[PDB]
Design a binder for this molecule. Structure first.
Ligand SMILES: [Mg+2]
Ligand SMILES: [Mg+2]
Ligand SMILES: [Mg+2]
Ligand SMILES: [Mg+2]
Ligand SMILES: [Mg+2]
Ligand SMILES: [Mg+2]
Ligand SMILES: [Mg+2]
Ligand SMILES: [Mg+2]
Ligand SMILES: [Mg+2]
Ligand SMILES: [Mg+2]
Ligand SMILES: [Mg+2]
Ligand SMILES: [Mg+2]
Ligand SMILES: [Mg+2]
Ligand SMILES: [Mg+2]
Ligand SMILES: [Mg+2]
Ligand SMILES: [Mg+2]
Ligand SMILES: [Mg+2]
Ligand SMILES: [Mg+2]
Ligand SMILES: [Mg+2]
Ligand SMILES: [Mg+2]
Ligand SMILES: [Mg+2]
Ligand SMILES: [Mg+2]
Ligand SMILES: [Mg+2]
Ligand SMILES: [Mg+2]
Ligand SMILES: [Mg+2]
Ligand SMILES: [Mg+2]
Ligand SMILES: [Mg+2]
Ligand SMILES: [Mg+2]
Ligand SMILES: [Mg+2]
Ligand SMILES: [Mg+2]
Ligand SMILES: [Mg+2]
Ligand SMILES: [Mg+2]
Ligand SMILES: [Mg+2]
Ligand SMILES: [Mg+2]
Ligand SMILES: [Mg+2]
Ligand SMILES: [Mg+2]
Ligand SMILES: [Mg+2]
Ligand SMILES: [Mg+2]
Ligand SMILES: [Mg+2]
Ligand SMILES: [Mg+2]
Ligand SMILES: [Mg+2]
Ligand SMILES: [Mg+2]
Ligand SMILES: [Mg+2]
Ligand SMILES: [Mg+2]
Ligand SMILES: [Mg+2]
Ligand SMILES: [Mg+2]
Ligand SMILES: [Mg+2]
Ligand SMILES: [Mg+2]
Ligand SMILES: [Mg+2]
Ligand SMILES: [Mg+2]
Ligand SMILES: [Mg+2]
Ligand SMILES: [Mg+2]
Ligand SMILES: [Mg+2]
Ligand SMILES: [Mg+2]
Ligand SMILES: [Mg+2]
Ligand SMILES: [Mg+2]
Ligand SMILES: [Mg+2]
Ligand SMILES: [Mg+2]
Ligand SMILES: [Mg+2]
Ligand SMILES: [Mg+2]
Ligand SMILES: [Mg+2]
Ligand SMILES: [Mg+2]
Ligand SMILES: [Mg+2]
Ligand SMILES: [Mg+2]
Ligand SMILES: [Mg+2]
Ligand SMILES: [Mg+2]
Ligand SMILES: [Mg+2]
Ligand SMILES: [Mg+2]
Ligand SMILES: [Mg+2]
Ligand SMILES: [Mg+2]
Ligand SMILES: [Mg+2]
Ligand SMILES: [Mg+2]
Ligand SMILES: [Mg+2]
Ligand SMILES: [Mg+2]
Ligand SMILES: [Mg+2]
Ligand SMILES: [Mg+2]
Ligand SMILES: [Mg+2]
Ligand SMILES: [Mg+2]
Ligand SMILES: [Mg+2]
Ligand SMILES: [Mg+2]
Ligand SMILES: [Mg+2]
Ligand SMILES: [Mg+2]
Ligand SMILES: [Mg+2]
Ligand SMILES: [Mg+2]
Ligand SMILES: [Mg+2]
Ligand SMILES: [Mg+2]
Ligand SMILES: [Mg+2]
Ligand SMILES: [Mg+2]
Ligand SMILES: [Mg+2]
Ligand SMILES: [Mg+2]
Ligand SMILES: [Mg+2]
Ligand SMILES: [Mg+2]
Ligand SMILES: [Mg+2]
Ligand SMILES: [Mg+2]
Ligand SMILES: [Mg+2]
Ligand SMILES: [Mg+2]
Ligand SMILES: [Mg+2]
Ligand SMILES: [Mg+2]
Ligand SMILES: [Mg+2]
Ligand SMILES: [Mg+2]
Ligand SMILES: [Mg+2]
Ligand SMILES: [Mg+2]
Ligand SMILES: [Mg+2]
Ligand SMILES: [Mg+2]
Ligand SMILES: [Mg+2]
Ligand SMILES: [Mg+2]
Ligand SMILES: [Mg+2]
Ligand SMILES: [Mg+2]
Ligand SMILES: [Mg+2]
Ligand SMILES: [Mg+2]
Ligand SMILES: [Mg+2]
Ligand SMILES: [Mg+2]
Ligand SMILES: [Mg+2]
Ligand SMILES: [Mg+2]
Ligand SMILES: [Mg+2]
Ligand SMILES: [Mg+2]
Ligand SMILES: [Mg+2]
Ligand SMILES: [Mg+2]
Ligand SMILES: [Mg+2]
Ligand SMILES: [Mg+2]
Ligand SMILES: [Mg+2]
Ligand SMILES: [Mg+2]
Ligand SMILES: [Mg+2]
Ligand SMILES: [Mg+2]
Ligand SMILES: [Mg+2]
Ligand SMILES: [Mg+2]
Ligand SMILES: [Mg+2]
Ligand SMILES: [Mg+2]
Ligand SMILES: [Mg+2]
Ligand SMILES: [Mg+2]
Ligand SMILES: [Mg+2]
Ligand SMILES: [Mg+2]
Ligand SMILES: [Mg+2]
Ligand SMILES: [Mg+2]
Ligand SMILES: [Mg+2]
Ligand SMILES: [Mg+2]
Ligand SMILES: [Mg+2]
Ligand SMILES: [Mg+2]
Ligand SMILES: [Mg+2]
Ligand SMILES: [Mg+2]
Ligand SMILES: [Mg+2]
Ligand SMILES: [Mg+2]
Ligand SMILES: [Mg+2]
Ligand SMILES: [Mg+2]
Ligand SMILES: [Mg+2]
Ligand SMILES: [Mg+2]
Ligand SMILES: [Mg+2]
Ligand SMILES: [Mg+2]
Ligand SMILES: [Mg+2]
Ligand SMILES: [Mg+2]
Ligand SMILES: [Mg+2]
Ligand SMILES: [Mg+2]
Ligand SMILES: [Mg+2]
Ligand SMILES: [Mg+2]
Ligand SMILES: [Mg+2]
Ligand SMILES: [Mg+2]
Ligand SMILES: [Mg+2]
Ligand SMILES: [Mg+2]
Ligand SMILES: [Mg+2]
Ligand SMILES: [Mg+2]
Ligand SMILES: [Mg+2]
Ligand SMILES: [Mg+2]
Ligand SMILES: [Mg+2]
Ligand SMILES: [Mg+2]
Ligand SMILES: [Mg+2]
Ligand SMILES: [Mg+2]
Ligand SMILES: [Mg+2]
Ligand SMILES: [Mg+2]
Ligand SMILES: [Mg+2]
Ligand SMILES: [Mg+2]
Ligand SMILES: [Mg+2]
Ligand SMILES: [Mg+2]
Ligand SMILES: [Mg+2]
Ligand SMILES: [Mg+2]
Ligand SMILES: [Mg+2]
Ligand SMILES: [Mg+2]
Ligand SMILES: [Mg+2]
Ligand SMILES: [Mg+2]
Ligand SMILES: [Mg+2]
Ligand SMILES: [Mg+2]
Ligand SMILES: [Mg+2]
Ligand SMILES: [Mg+2]
Ligand SMILES: [Mg+2]
Ligand SMILES: [Mg+2]
Ligand SMILES: [Mg+2]
Ligand SMILES: [Mg+2]
Ligand SMILES: [Mg+2]
Ligand SMILES: [Mg+2]
Ligand SMILES: [Mg+2]
Ligand SMILES: [Mg+2]
Ligand SMILES: [Mg+2]
Ligand SMILES: [Mg+2]
Ligand SMILES: [Mg+2]
Ligand SMILES: [Mg+2]
Ligand SMILES: [Mg+2]
Ligand SMILES: [Mg+2]
Ligand SMILES: [Mg+2]
Ligand SMILES: [Mg+2]
Ligand SMILES: [Zn+2]
Lengths: 48, 59, 118, 116, 112
RNA sequence: GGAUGACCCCAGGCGGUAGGGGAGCGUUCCCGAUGCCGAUGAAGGCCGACCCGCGAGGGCGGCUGGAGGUAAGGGAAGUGCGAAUGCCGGCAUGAGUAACGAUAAAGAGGGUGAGAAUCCCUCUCGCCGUAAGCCCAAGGGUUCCUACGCAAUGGUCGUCAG
RNA sequence: GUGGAGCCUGGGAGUGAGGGCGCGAGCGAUAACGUCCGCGUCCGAGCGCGGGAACAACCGAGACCGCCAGCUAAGGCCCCC
RNA sequence: GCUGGGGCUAGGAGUGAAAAGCUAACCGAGCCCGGAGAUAGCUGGUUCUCCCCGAAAUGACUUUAGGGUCAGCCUCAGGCG
RNA sequence: CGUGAGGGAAAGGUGAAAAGAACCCCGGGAGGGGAGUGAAAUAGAGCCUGAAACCGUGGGCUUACAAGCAGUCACGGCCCC
RNA sequence: AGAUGGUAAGGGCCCACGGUGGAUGCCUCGGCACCCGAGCCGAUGAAGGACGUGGCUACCUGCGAUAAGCCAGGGGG
């Protein structure tokens, strides 16, 4: 049957993207937290 | 059914006892009257190609 | 049980089994000698002997009968004109089966050759 | 500082497993099972050290009895005579006499009949 | 004098090959060759190679005579197992052990 | 008894769960140590039917190992495991057992190759055909084409392959 | 009456589900391997030893270690024994 | 009526032709991280050796009754004798 | 691994020195046997030490009329010192 | 009529030697604690990144189309 993951490049970028995170105080804290942890990717990689 | 399951681990003795019937029987072979090579009986000899006196097959 | 029952099943349904025999017949009559599994081989003898025996008749009826299984006019021409004649004085037994010594690698199947007799 | 297990536990298990040589299956190969088997073994040895003394005395008595009835009395009567005679040779030696030195045993029997 | 060959890390399960090995232990090189040739087992292929390599070692390196060689000793040891995943129902994942053999053949000389 | 813990003599006590008390063994570390043991072999490992200790243990001997170890007397603790449906790892049992993923289906001949039911070619047979054919868009991201390969991936095989 | 008696002052507890049996009662049905008290006992903790065929609490008896020595206890002495 | 694409509404909140249904395969109150080693009068588990002693499962009170405080019973030190 | 916030591993050691095994032999290869290096190669790269569970080969004793928590006590047979 | 042996398909105990596996000892390129030193960066575009950059270059490091580097001072030999 239809499962839960239904890939969409637009949806992905608009939801979890860098610009989306910078718009919101909570999203900026995500970027802060991940940078401090030393994540190689602050934001879900996606192709456009 | 209700999923039967082994109640106790089989001992090394009991596992090996089961396998007391597992030994291979060696292949039964006979000499080919033409080339004296060893081959299973009632088969065309795979070495010279002879069976029942005559050449039957190209080896 | 299986009491006094004749005929292998060879793990095929009715129409597949028929095809199997018909195809093996075409191949045997074509090359004079083929290699199969022992069971297929032992079962092919009767099927082909009958076809040969009908070619020995020669008439139109026999030709159209054999044509039901062999289906190929040229192959049947070969049957009547070149194969059948050399068995004019032979009373059945137009085929022989001899077993090979080596089994198939991939499944251990014992093999045998089936050939038309001299 | 830190005192990790290190060498100690292996050595302790090794001690037990050695004591368990000859045992069946895991009872000689698995520490846990060996230790359990050894508990039983230790109690048996203690208890059977105690019963060995019973076991032999019982055997001696059976043997003395056989030797007595050859001379027309039973063990009970024989021992009572010996008591009245004041012959304090124990049942270990009495049984030995009965087999090895029948003439001496025959003599002792007479003494026992007489003391009656 | 003895000659040995080992085939290490053979991708076959020990319990299987040993069946084949057991057939040739103690036998003459010639009989061992004939047996393996008509033994309907995958293992026959591997055991035969070790046999033949050991025979070569005997003749070429150890000054032993081919016409006198017999299988003095043979055995199979377990090598490291290749662990692989077998997917089952209801999201459960099992582990298949694709096992491995170390095959050893030791040849001696049958005098007299 | 002798002089006090030397050892001897006589006598009595000495089942034991919760629990109280006492005396010891071993582990890591510090002073002892600018020392001492050590390649004529450290620690660790594997044996021992030997010695000492009630015991925990401590010696000694042989093999392994190949660079550390550490006394008498004291000091300090991440100090002793058999169980926690404990944790991590390794390996067993079930077992050569169930299974190898739609019952659309196969057979032969000829190539290749160390090796072929499984790769290539040919003939015969079967299945789909509002599809199991073709063309887009999502998504996937070199999977495309050719050469050279078969350890692993492929539920078998493999010379073939996403 | 010198005993792992007793008293006094302190340190540390554990226990605060008991159970069977005997005797004396209540409850129950002059029932329960029942329930609730009293006196004692044993098991608990003596599932260590002998007897009771086997069997925590019935009979015998309180196991520091060793002995191929002796006497007994309950219970036994036709064979198993 | 079904359906693609683009959007909006969420945790005591959303959405619901109402089943406490659904809100990323467990929703009578989502998930992640944090408070956090919450708390657990409950269950489990608790590691070397030898030596001496050695209980209790009762009473009173207890939102107490399978938990406690005091007493009783065990042990150690000093004192009395 | 998770849409995401977020969760989050495993995995060190040849030898003094690569001197990391020319060349030959069996093999398609892998692997091995000689040769060679080294104080040492069961230090050979799947490399220091190399315990245990687990699997196997060889040898000693033993087992197909026997009743079991697998031991213990006694005696006898065989094998070894 | 009597009695007593060798059998091992296989199993068990012990011994030897292996395989597997990676405990233990030794080791330390790492970590932990305390103490002391030191303490802001950014529109002159930071922190942190993307894509690039080598004769042959997967990754890491370095660097930025002047790209494992350009200029000058100092050190060093
Ligand atoms: Mg459906
Ligand atoms: Mg649908
Ligand atoms: Mg996903
Ligand atoms: Mg998923
Ligand atoms: Mg959709
Ligand atoms: Mg899109
Ligand atoms: Mg969208
Ligand atoms: Mg965005
Ligand atoms: Mg701000
Ligand atoms: Mg955000
Ligand atoms: Mg990541
Ligand atoms: Mg990065
Ligand atoms: Mg993000
Ligand atoms: Mg059903
Ligand atoms: Mg089982
Ligand atoms: Mg078992
Ligand atoms: Mg077991
Ligand atoms: Mg079983
Ligand atoms: Mg075995
Ligand atoms: Mg012939
Ligand atoms: Mg039927
Ligand atoms: Mg018939
Ligand atoms: Mg039939
Ligand atoms: Mg038919
Ligand atoms: Mg078939
Ligand atoms: Mg079938
Ligand atoms: Mg049909
Ligand atoms: Mg028809
Ligand atoms: Mg031809
Ligand atoms: Mg037809
Ligand atoms: Mg055949
Ligand atoms: Mg064959
Ligand atoms: Mg195959
Ligand atoms: Mg055959
Ligand atoms: Mg520990
Ligand atoms: Mg043992
Ligand atoms: Mg034994
Ligand atoms: Mg004991
Ligand atoms: Mg005793
Ligand atoms: Mg005695
Ligand atoms: Mg006695
Ligand atoms: Mg008397
Ligand atoms: Mg007397
Ligand atoms: Mg005599
Ligand atoms: Mg096999
Ligand atoms: Mg075996
Ligand atoms: Mg065979
Ligand atoms: Mg040769
Ligand atoms: Mg499945
Ligand atoms: Mg699924
Ligand atoms: Mg398993
Ligand atoms: Mg497995
Ligand atoms: Mg394996
Ligand atoms: Mg005394
Ligand atoms: Mg005392
Ligand atoms: Mg006493
Ligand atoms: Mg005591
Ligand atoms: Mg210790
Ligand atoms: Mg000091
Ligand atoms: Mg020093
Ligand atoms: Mg010196
Ligand atoms: Mg040495
Ligand atoms: Mg140390
Ligand atoms: Mg030490
Ligand atoms: Mg000792
Ligand atoms: Mg010792
Ligand atoms: Mg020593
Ligand atoms: Mg040593
Ligand atoms: Mg040495
Ligand atoms: Mg040094
Ligand atoms: Mg402490
Ligand atoms: Mg600790
Ligand atoms: Mg414990
Ligand atoms: Mg379970
Ligand atoms: Mg269970
Ligand atoms: Mg747990
Ligand atoms: Mg554990
Ligand atoms: Mg596990
Ligand atoms: Mg089977
Ligand atoms: Mg079964
Ligand atoms: Mg079955
Ligand atoms: Mg099946
Ligand atoms: Mg399938
Ligand atoms: Mg399946
Ligand atoms: Mg199928
Ligand atoms: Mg089918
Ligand atoms: Mg072909
Ligand atoms: Mg060619
Ligand atoms: Mg060819
Ligand atoms: Mg193939
Ligand atoms: Mg092939
Ligand atoms: Mg073909
Ligand atoms: Mg197929
Ligand atoms: Mg149709
Ligand atoms: Mg149509
Ligand atoms: Mg249709
Ligand atoms: Mg696209
Ligand atoms: Mg993908
Ligand atoms: Mg081209
Ligand atoms: Mg492959
Ligand atoms: Mg392959
Ligand atoms: Mg292959
Ligand atoms: Mg390759
Ligand atoms: Mg495969
Ligand atoms: Mg598959
Ligand atoms: Mg190709
Ligand atoms: Mg392709
Ligand atoms: Mg008094
Ligand atoms: Mg007292
Ligand atoms: Mg008292
Ligand atoms: Mg007091
Ligand atoms: Mg007190
Ligand atoms: Mg205290
Ligand atoms: Mg309490
Ligand atoms: Mg209470
Ligand atoms: Mg109470
Ligand atoms: Mg009560
Ligand atoms: Mg009461
Ligand atoms: Mg009481
Ligand atoms: Mg009772
Ligand atoms: Mg009375
Ligand atoms: Mg009454
Ligand atoms: Mg009553
Ligand atoms: Mg009553
Ligand atoms: Mg009472
Ligand atoms: Mg209790
Ligand atoms: Mg009792
Ligand atoms: Mg008492
Ligand atoms: Mg009982
Ligand atoms: Mg009793
Ligand atoms: Mg009794
Ligand atoms: Mg008496
Ligand atoms: Mg009496
Ligand atoms: Mg009487
Ligand atoms: Mg009697
Ligand atoms: Mg719409
Ligand atoms: Mg829509
Ligand atoms: Mg959308
Ligand atoms: Mg909520
Ligand atoms: Mg919340
Ligand atoms: Mg609401
Ligand atoms: Mg989720
Ligand atoms: Mg859901
Ligand atoms: Mg709630
Ligand atoms: Mg959910
Ligand atoms: Mg947070
Ligand atoms: Mg708090
Ligand atoms: Mg609370
Ligand atoms: Mg006492
Ligand atoms: Mg009370
Ligand atoms: Mg009461
Ligand atoms: Mg109140
Ligand atoms: Mg209550
Ligand atoms: Mg409570
Ligand atoms: Mg109190
Ligand atoms: Mg006092
Ligand atoms: Mg006093
Ligand atoms: Mg995912
Ligand atoms: Mg992802
Ligand atoms: Mg290593
Ligand atoms: Mg080195
Ligand atoms: Mg080095
Ligand atoms: Mg070659
Ligand atoms: Mg060659
Ligand atoms: Mg090839
Ligand atoms: Mg090579
Ligand atoms: Mg080599
Ligand atoms: Mg040399
Ligand atoms: Mg040298
Ligand atoms: Mg030396
Ligand atoms: Mg070598
Ligand atoms: Mg070595
Ligand atoms: Mg070594
Ligand atoms: Mg070494
Ligand atoms: Mg070293
Ligand atoms: Mg090693
Ligand atoms: Mg190893
Ligand atoms: Mg080992
Ligand atoms: Mg053996
Ligand atoms: Mg009988
Ligand atoms: Mg017998
Ligand atoms: Mg028996
Ligand atoms: Mg029993
Ligand atoms: Mg016995
Ligand atoms: Mg006796
Ligand atoms: Mg006999
Ligand atoms: Mg045997
Ligand atoms: Mg056998
Ligand atoms: Mg080993
Ligand atoms: Mg290893
Ligand atoms: Mg150290
Ligand atoms: Mg440091
Ligand atoms: Mg400052
Ligand atoms: Mg930057
Ligand atoms: Mg770079
Ligand atoms: Mg410059
Ligand atoms: Mg410069
Ligand atoms: Mg300069
Ligand atoms: Zn021939």
């Amino acid at each position: 049957m239809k499962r839960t993951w239904q890939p969409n490049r637009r949806k992905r970028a608009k939801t979890h993207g860098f610009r989306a995170r910078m718009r919101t105080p909570g999203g900026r804290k995500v970027l802060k937290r991940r940078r401090q942890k030393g994540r190689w990717r602050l934001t879900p990689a996606v192709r456009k | 059914a209700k999923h039967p399951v082994p109640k106790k681990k089989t001992s090394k003795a009991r596992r090996d006892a089961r396998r007391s019937h597992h030994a291979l029987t060696p292949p039964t072979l006979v000499p080919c009257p033409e080339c004296k090579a060893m081959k299973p009986p009632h088969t065309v000899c795979p070495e010279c190609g002879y069976y029942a006196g005559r050449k039957v097959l190209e080896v | 049980m299986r009491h006094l029952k004749s005929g292998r099943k060879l793990n095929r349904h009715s129409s597949h089994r028929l095809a199997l025999y018909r195809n093996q017949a075409k191949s045997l009559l074509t090359h004079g000698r083929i290699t199969t599994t022992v069971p297929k081989a032992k079962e092919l003898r009767g099927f082909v002997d009958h076809l040969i025996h009908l070619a020995k008749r020669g008439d139109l009826h026999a030709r159209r009968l054999v044509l039901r299984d062999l289906q190929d006019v040229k192959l049947v021409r070969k049957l009547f004109d070149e194969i059948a004649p050399r068995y004019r004085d032979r009373q059945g037994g137009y085929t022989r089966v001899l077993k090979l010594a080596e089994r198939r690698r991939g499944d251990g199947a014992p093999l045998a050759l089936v050939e038309l007799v001299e | 500082p830190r005192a990790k297990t290190g060498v100690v536990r292996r050595r302790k298990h090794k001690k037990i497993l050695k004591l368990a040589k000859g045992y069946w299956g895991l009872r000689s190969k698995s520490f846990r099972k060996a230790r359990e088997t050894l508990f039983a073994a230790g109690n048996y040895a203690y208890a059977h050290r105690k019963r060995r003394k019973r076991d032999f005395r019982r055997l001696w008595i059976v043997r003395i009895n056989a030797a007595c009835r050859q001379h027309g009395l039973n063990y009970s009567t024989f021992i009572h005579g010996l008591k009245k005679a004041g012959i304090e040779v124990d049942r270990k030696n009495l049984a030995d006499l009965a087999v090895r030195e029948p003439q001496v045993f025959a003599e002792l029997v007479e003494r026992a009949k007489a003391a009656q | 004098m003895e000659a040995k060959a080992i085939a290490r890390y053979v991708r076959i399960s020990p319990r299987k090959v040993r069946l084949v090995v057991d057939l040739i232990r103690g036998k003459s090189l010639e009989e061992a060759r004939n047996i393996l040739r008509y033994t309907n087992k995958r293992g026959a292929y591997f055991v035969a190679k070790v046999l033949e390599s050991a025979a070569a070692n005997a003749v070429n390196n150890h000054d032993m005579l081919e016409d006198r060689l017999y299988v003095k000793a043979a055995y199979v040891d377990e090598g490291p197992a290749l662990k692989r995943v077998l997917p089952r129902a209801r999201g459960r994942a099992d582990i298949i052990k694709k096992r491995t053999s170390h095959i050893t053949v030791i040849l001696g000389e049958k005098h007299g």
